[PDB]
């Protein structure tokens, strides 16, 4: 069907600072049992259950503070 | 709207009343007299000039004297007034950042368990550089602007009265352009700085993650994201800058008027009523 | 000078940040007024009929105006090429001159301005005639003449066809900002209400009821605006009504109408179903023709709930209650859809 | 006494048909009246239909600049010419109205040509403007009748009047040439076709708030359309929605177009260019010269017409300081005075007028410069950002190359360089005119105070500088107490996060004590910023008034070449107030311009560096 789409996750996980939805979905058509499949999938309920607003916290440095491993999450996500 | 009519004040008596008790009793009055007493020398050697031109074209003789005595004393007093105006910034700094140290020492720790730390350490570095270096100049200059305008405005008021019955349209409209001007200008600024933070934000995370994003090669998204908040801020400058040219458009028709009014008011006096020459070029300048 | 907007950042400052119906427009209002942006639309020259039109159209005390002005430019050019006139022969020069003047008894332009008076509005005071050696003022008063009889001509035709269209200037017929869903006959059906309050029959008054949809056909069809027309459900399945008091408009809903597939929760603010009502209808006092367009979004249905009846038989006629018009009370109403409705009934 | 038209001398004669009408003056003045009246008249109903009715109709015709410059011109010296008239009938007892009142109604003809110019342009009709194009050309005729009956009668060039009316007929000329070009353009009177019109697509779409750029240049000038922004404010509060999307003229991407379209002709023609720093200079210059142009050539008559202000006031003084002060138009030719301007530009009251009429055109020149400079400006620092962004994404991420150069140190490039850039670009106007400011401000206190002058104003030239080097020291207290302040904040965000830990420990008297012992450090500091500070305000608004007292003290004591008149003195403090002004920023324009400087070494370094290119296919 110059190379196509790849998709990637450094070693050094890299974030945006914005809503965590929009975090993961990084500029996609949102499919909702998609997302909530990879979310459970990723382990992602303890953080965004404890964070303050859950599914729309402003992810990603200057924002709320997560840790390495629940970044390495996300961005796998 | 009531919340947003609410919105639209000064707001002098919440903070401004605190930061003038904040500044003492030596260096309140010291300040208001040094600045007073600075324009009052400076108006009283234009005047002096003007007596001594009359006097010119023919009491004393030497007037050379008194002008010196004048000028002096202008310097002396503008040289007061400025190390009044930056020593009152420097206290107030000053005994304001160990208040809110010793404030912030006794919070109780549900204050930090539901508010971000991101207001407080706004209200900790943003306002505190703001009083430490912005506030202190802006206050000069205002009351520096604000009472040479009084000056301007009473002495050509002396000179012809008929301006001073004039003023009040004139100063009306001045009230109301710069009302709408302040409510206009506000919003404006606010908006300038908050369409500012998210662009340099923007910058450093592509910065950080360049190899993400040439991976998805979703450039071209990234590149329309860019144009659309260089935009969204170009556009908020550019109105900025246009209330401003408005504002200074407007009172400069209205500062025209006005040198109109008093040109023409001052030479018909001066034709028939015979009023001294030099006091019509003060007025005038 | 000034701060001069403070040009020396000399360090960007990082600043945390911290926490500090109009989707969807509606091009018939409730009132009826209609905005539906005309973009990019080849333009017709506006001839100066254009401008005749608009001159018939304005107001009453901005129509004195212009007509007292247009009557005053008239007089006093007029009187300004009389002056000139008379001046360019010499009657405005010293008299005792032998030269009989064009004008008679023209001394200053007050006098001129006097006579165009009398020659514009036919009065004619006669002090001030005009005489013979002077053809241009012939010309020119015959030019005077046929213009101030066609202005008199445009001011009465112009308060002619004010009197005429202005008697029909008054739109007061009233709906309701809230319509309902509610069982009758055991059928669901929608329910509206209209009156007429200038006290003024309506003759052959017709009411038509549109769902407007962005209904994508099956095929794969797409459609932006999509209306359907509603039946009335009358006695006879006309669309002629007869106002008197307030009516409820109940058209009922059947398998074929649209509304086969409402629920309460697609009542939600924002979905695209909007019912247009229109009542057309002639004024017998006037002989107008007239409509009446009102519009109405999800937010404004109500489910389920049935009116105030207004006719109070009061004892030598009947009262109408205006002020209990558009208040409705609950009721015992489903949030079945109509097929499942239906179905239900069919089986028990 | 009845108020005439023409003499009421010598009983009034002076309306007699002797050896022809066009022979007598007083006839062909009259005869300018009419073209006026018959405008007034017939346009007034048409207009007033205007004012009574029951957003994007936009258009602009052919020519739209010239008919606005020359109608200002027009009025101009129509009010000229009313000014001429006023003084030369001083003489007679009698009105004499006539040396006026046509000139009068004519600036009222041209303000209403105006009006109606505009409601025709709006409402895209054009064959309403034949109604105007006639008058031209009859205001044409008389008007250029009454010229050469002047000219038959030996008048000349000596007397205002004749310059005056051969001025204004060579603008009723300029823009009858105008009315015809735009029937040449559009076609609309006697045409089978007229070509289509159509308005610019950017106001295409209703969406779009920001018109200034397409409004009529009178509108430009005072910002009228703002009105309408501005009262919305006060209604409802500000937001995004409010401000619509800018012109397709100033996009960032339009921009970024024409900055890559001066990069490229830049590196075609010039074979051996690296796109270094000049090269970038090179560019900038290409793409944005016609408009820096602009605002320059604005400024600089700013400042000229400003000057004017000082000079007037000296007029005034002066001619109204005389021991006679009587005075009396002299010449005159066939029972009318006629004033020449050799003493027309004596009159106190015209000069005021005029010194009123001078002010206007200098404020709205100034404003209009302010706003194209900045504006321009702000196209850059757009153009600017994308093509750094555009840089960004060709960048390789090498250890060497991503490393020597980390996120932070490019964002502030970003941030800082190219703030200082738009900056640079915002007083590049002042650096070619201050210069000019400063040149002519001391020239003309030469002429008006004979030696001493300059001698004084050495006074403020010298004081510049030092307010330089104050600035410069300032930055530098600045910038240490910046240190400090960035230390300071490390310790108090540290101190901050762990709050609750430090509210456990009970520790938190010890590490205040320290965040208070890091702020006395640097609030030494902070006392030299705020004393230098203080050093600066007091020398800029204090320089002035020694400066003053230093010349006026030396003229009279060591020159003493004569007295020190009122006009003398009034003109020497209103122009040094005047020059004032740009000596103070000065400073500020040159440490831009070294920031400037700075900032596209940096800028050049950073897109002189590695790229990773993709093969194409
Ligand atoms: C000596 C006689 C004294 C009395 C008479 C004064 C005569 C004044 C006429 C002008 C003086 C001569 C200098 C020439 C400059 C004239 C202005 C001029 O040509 O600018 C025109 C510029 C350019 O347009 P653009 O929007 O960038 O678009 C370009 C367009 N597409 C193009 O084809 O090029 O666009 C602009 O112009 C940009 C906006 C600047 C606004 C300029 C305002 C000044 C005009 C006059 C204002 C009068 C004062 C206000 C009166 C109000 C009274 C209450
Ligand atoms: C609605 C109101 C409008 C008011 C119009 C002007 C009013 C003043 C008229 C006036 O004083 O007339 C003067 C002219 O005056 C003119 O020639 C007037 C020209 C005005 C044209 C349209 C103005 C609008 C007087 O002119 P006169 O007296 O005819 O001149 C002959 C002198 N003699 C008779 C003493 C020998
Ligand atoms: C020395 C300073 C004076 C001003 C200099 C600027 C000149 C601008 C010329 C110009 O605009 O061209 C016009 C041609 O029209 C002509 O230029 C010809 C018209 C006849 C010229 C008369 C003979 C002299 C065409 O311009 P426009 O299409 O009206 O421009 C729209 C401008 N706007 C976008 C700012 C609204
Ligand atoms: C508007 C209507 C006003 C008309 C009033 C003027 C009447 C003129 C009658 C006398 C006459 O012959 O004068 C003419 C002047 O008028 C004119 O030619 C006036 C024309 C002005 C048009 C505007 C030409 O007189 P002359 O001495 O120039 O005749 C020899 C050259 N053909
Ligand atoms: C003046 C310009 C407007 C056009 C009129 C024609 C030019 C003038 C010709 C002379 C004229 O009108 O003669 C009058 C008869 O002609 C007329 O009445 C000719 C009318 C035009 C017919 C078409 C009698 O003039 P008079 O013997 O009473 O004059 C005595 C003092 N010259
Ligand atoms: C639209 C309206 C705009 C009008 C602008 C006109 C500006 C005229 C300025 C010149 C001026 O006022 O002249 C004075 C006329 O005053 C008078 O003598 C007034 C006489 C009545 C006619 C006005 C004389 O001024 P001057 O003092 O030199 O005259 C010597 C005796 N004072
Ligand atoms: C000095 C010479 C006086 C000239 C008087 C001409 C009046 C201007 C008529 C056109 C006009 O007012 O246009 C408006 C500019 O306002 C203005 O021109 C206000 C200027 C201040 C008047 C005093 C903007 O209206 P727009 O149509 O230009 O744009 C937006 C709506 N369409
Ligand atoms: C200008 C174009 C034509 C110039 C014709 C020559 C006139 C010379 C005027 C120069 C001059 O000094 O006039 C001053 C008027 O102010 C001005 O010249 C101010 C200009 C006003 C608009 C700019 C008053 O000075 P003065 O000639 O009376 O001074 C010496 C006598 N004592
Ligand atoms: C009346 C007479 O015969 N001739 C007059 C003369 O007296 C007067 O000086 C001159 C200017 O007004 O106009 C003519």
Redesign the interface.
């Known amino acids: 069907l110059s190379r196509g789409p790849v998709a990637y996750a450094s070693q050094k996980p890299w974030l945006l600072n914005a809503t965590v939805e929009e975090n993961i979905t990084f500029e996609s058509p949102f499919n909702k049992q998609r997302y909530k499949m990879v979310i459970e999938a990723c382990s992602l309920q303890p953080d965004i259950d404890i964070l303050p607003h859950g599914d729309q916290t402003q992810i990603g440095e200057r924002g709320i503070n997560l840790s390495g491993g629940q970044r390495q999450r996300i961005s796998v996500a | 709207?009531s919340s947003?009519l609410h919105?639209?004040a000064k707001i002098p008596w919440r903070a401004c009343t605190k930061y003038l008790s904040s500044a003492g009793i030596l260096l309140l009055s010291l300040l208001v007299f040094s600045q007073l007493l600075k324009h009052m020398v400076?108006v009283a050697?234009?005047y002096w000039?003007?007596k001594?031109?009359?006097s010119?074209?023919v009491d004393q003789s030497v007037y050379?004297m008194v002008?010196?005595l004048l000028?002096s004393l202008?310097?002396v007093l503008?040289?007061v007034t400025?190390?009044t105006?930056?020593?009152t910034?420097?206290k107030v700094?000053?005994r304001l950042?160990?208040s809110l140290?010793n404030r912030?020492?006794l919070?109780p720790?549900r204050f930090?368990e539901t508010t971000?730390?991101?207001?407080?350490?706004?209200r900790?570095?943003?306002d505190c550089?703001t009083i430490?270096?912005?506030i202190?100049?802006?206050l000069?200059?205002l009351s520096?602007?604000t009472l040479l305008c009084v000056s301007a405005l009473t002495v050509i008021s002396y000179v012809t009265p008929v301006f001073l019955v004039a003023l009040l349209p004139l100063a009306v409209v001045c009230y109301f352009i710069q009302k709408?001007?302040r409510?206009?200008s506000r919003?404006?600024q606010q908006?300038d700085d908050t369409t500012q933070?998210p662009?340099?934000?923007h910058?450093?995370?592509?910065?950080?993650?360049?190899?993400?994003?040439?991976?998805?090669?979703?450039?071209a998204?990234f590149?329309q994201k860019?144009?659309e908040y260089?935009?969204?801020n170009?556009?908020?400058?550019?109105?900025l800058?246009?209330?401003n040219?408005?504002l200074?458009?407007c009172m400069?028709?209205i500062?025209?008027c006005v040198?109109?009014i008093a040109?023409?008011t001052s030479?018909s006096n001066?034709?028939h009523r015979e009023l001294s020459?030099?006091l019509?070029?003060?007025g005038?300048? | 000078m000034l701060s001069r907007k403070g040009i020396i950042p000399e360090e960007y400052v990082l600043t945390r940040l911290a926490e500090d119906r109009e989707r969807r427009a509606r091009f018939v209002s409730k009132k009826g007024n209609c905005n539906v942006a005309h973009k990019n639309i080849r333009e017709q020259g506006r001839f100066l009929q254009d401008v005749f039109t608009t001159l018939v159209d304005l107001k009453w005390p901005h129509t004195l105006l212009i007509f007292t002005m247009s009557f005053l430019c008239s007089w006093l050019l007029f009187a300004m090429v009389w002056w000139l006139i008379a001046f360019a022969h010499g009657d405005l020069a010293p008299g005792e001159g032998t030269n009989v003047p064009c004008v008679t008894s023209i001394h200053s332009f007050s006098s001129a301005f006097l006579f165009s008076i009398e020659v514009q509005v036919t009065i004619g005071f006669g002090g001030r005639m005009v005489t013979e050696e002077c053809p241009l003022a012939i010309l020119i008063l015959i030019v005077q003449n046929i213009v101030g009889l066609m202005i008199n001509a445009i001011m009465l035709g112009c308060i002619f066809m004010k009197t005429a269209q202005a008697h029909r200037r008054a739109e007061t017929l009233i709906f309701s900002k809230h319509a309902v869903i509610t069982l009758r006959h055991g059928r669901l059906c929608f329910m509206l209400r209209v009156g007429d309050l200038r006290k003024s029959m309506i003759i052959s008054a017709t009411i038509h009821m549109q769902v407007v949809r962005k209904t994508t056909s099956p095929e794969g069809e797409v459609v932006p605006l999509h209306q359907v027309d509603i039946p009335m459900e009358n006695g006879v399945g006309g669309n002629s009504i007869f106002l008197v008091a307030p009516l409820i408009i109940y058209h009922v809903i059947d398998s074929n109408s649209p509304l086969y597939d409402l629920a309460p929760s697609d009542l939600h603010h924002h979905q695209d179903l909007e019912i247009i009502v229109i009542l057309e209808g002639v004024v017998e006092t006037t002989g107008i023709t007239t409509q009446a367009r009102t519009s109405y979004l999800a937010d404004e249905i109500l489910w389920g709930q049935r009116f105030v009846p207004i006719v109070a038989e009061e004892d030598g006629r009947y009262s109408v209650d205006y002020s209990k018009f558009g208040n409705t009370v609950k009721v015992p109403t489903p949030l079945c859809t109509a097929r499942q409705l239906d179905e239900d009934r069919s089986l028990l | 006494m009845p108020l005439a038209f023409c003499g009421t001398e010598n009983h009034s004669a002076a309306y007699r048909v002797d050896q022809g009408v066009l022979n007598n003056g007083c006839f062909v003045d009259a005869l300018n009246v009419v073209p006026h009246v018959f405008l007034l008249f017939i346009t007034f109903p048409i207009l007033f239909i205007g004012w009574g009715s029951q957003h994007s109709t936009w258009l602009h015709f052919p020519g739209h600049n010239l008919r606005w410059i020359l109608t200002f011109i027009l009025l101009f010296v129509l009010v000229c010419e009313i000014a001429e008239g006023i003084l030369s009938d001083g003489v007679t007892e009698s009105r004499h109205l006539h040396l006026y009142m046509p000139a009068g109604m004519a600036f009222m003809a041209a303000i209403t040509s105006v009006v109606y110019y505009h409601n025709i342009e709006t409402s895209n009709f054009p064959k309403l403007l034949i109604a105007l194009l006639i008058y031209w050309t009859l205001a044409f005729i008389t008007k250029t009748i009454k010229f050469v009956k002047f000219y038959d009668h030996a008048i000349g060039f000596s007397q205002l009047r004749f310059c005056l009316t051969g001025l204004l007929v060579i603008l009723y000329g300029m823009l009858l040439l105008v009315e015809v070009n735009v029937i040449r353009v559009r076609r609309y009177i006697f045409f089978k076709t007229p070509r289509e019109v159509k308005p610019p697509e950017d106001l295409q779409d209703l969406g779009v708030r920001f018109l200034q750029p397409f409004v009529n240049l009178l509108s430009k000038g005072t910002y009228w359309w703002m009105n309408a922004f501005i009262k919305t404010a006060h209604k409802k509060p500000i937001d995004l929605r409010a401000i619509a999307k800018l012109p397709i003229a100033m996009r960032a991407l339009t921009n970024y177009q024409r900055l890559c379209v001066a990069f490229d002709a830049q590196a075609r023609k010039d074979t051996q260019s690296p796109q270094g720093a000049r090269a970038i200079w090179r560019a900038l210059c290409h793409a944005f010269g016609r408009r820096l142009i602009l605002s320059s050539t604005f400024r600089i008559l700013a400042d000229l017409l400003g000057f004017a202000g000082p000079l007037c006031i000296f007029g005034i003084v002066d001619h109204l300081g005389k021991e006679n002060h009587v005075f009396q138009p002299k010449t005159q030719f066939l029972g009318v005075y006629f004033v020449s301007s050799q003493e027309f530009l004596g009159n106190a009251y015209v000069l005021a007028v005029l010194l009123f009429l001078a002010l206007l055109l200098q404020r709205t020149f100034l404003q209009a410069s302010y706003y194209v400079a900045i504006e321009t400006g702000i196209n850059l620092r757009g153009a600017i950002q994308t093509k750094i962004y555009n840089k960004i994404m060709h960048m390789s991420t090498s250890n060497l190359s991503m490393g020597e150069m980390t996120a932070g140190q490019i964002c502030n490039l970003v941030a800082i360089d190219t703030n200082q850039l738009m900056w640079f670009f915002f007083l590049c106007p002042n650096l070619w005119t201050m210069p000019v400011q400063i040149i002519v401000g001391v020239i003309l206190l030469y002429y008006i105070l004979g030696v001493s002058a300059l001698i004084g104003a050495a006074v403020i030239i010298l004081l510049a500088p030092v307010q330089y080097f104050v600035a410069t020291k300032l930055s530098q207290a600045q910038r240490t107490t910046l240190e400090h302040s960035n230390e300071r904040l490390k310790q108090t965000n540290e101190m901050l996060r762990g709050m609750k830990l430090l509210k456990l420990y009970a520790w938190e008297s010890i590490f205040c004590s320290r965040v208070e012992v890091t702020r006395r450090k640097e609030m030494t500091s902070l006392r030299a910023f705020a004393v230098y500070t203080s050093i600066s305000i007091f020398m800029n608004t204090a320089i002035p008034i020694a400066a003053v007292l230093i010349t006026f003290v030396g003229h009279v004591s060591f020159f003493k070449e004569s007295d020190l008149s009122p006009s003398v003195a009034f003109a020497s403090l209103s122009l040094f107030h005047i020059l004032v002004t740009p000596l103070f920023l000065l400073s500020s324009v040159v440490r831009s311009t070294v920031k400037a400087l700075v900032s596209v070494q940096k800028l050049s370094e950073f897109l002189s560096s590695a790229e990773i290119r993709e093969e194409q296919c």
């Open positions: 709207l947003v919105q639209r400076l050697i234009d000039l003007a001594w031109t009359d010119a074209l050379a002008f010196t000028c202008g310097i503008c040289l400025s190390v105006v930056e020593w910034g420097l700094a000053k950042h160990r140290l912030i020492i919070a720790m930090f971000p730390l991101g207001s407080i350490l706004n900790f570095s943003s550089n430490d270096q912005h202190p100049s802006t000069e200059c520096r602007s709408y001007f409510v206009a919003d404006l908006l933070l662009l340099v934000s910058f450093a995370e592509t910065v950080e993650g360049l190899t993400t994003i040439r991976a998805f090669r979703y450039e998204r590149q860019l144009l260089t935009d969204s170009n556009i908020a400058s550019l109105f800058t246009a209330a040219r408005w200074e458009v400069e028709y500062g025209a040198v109109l040109a023409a030479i001066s034709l020459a030099g019509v070029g003060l005038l300048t």
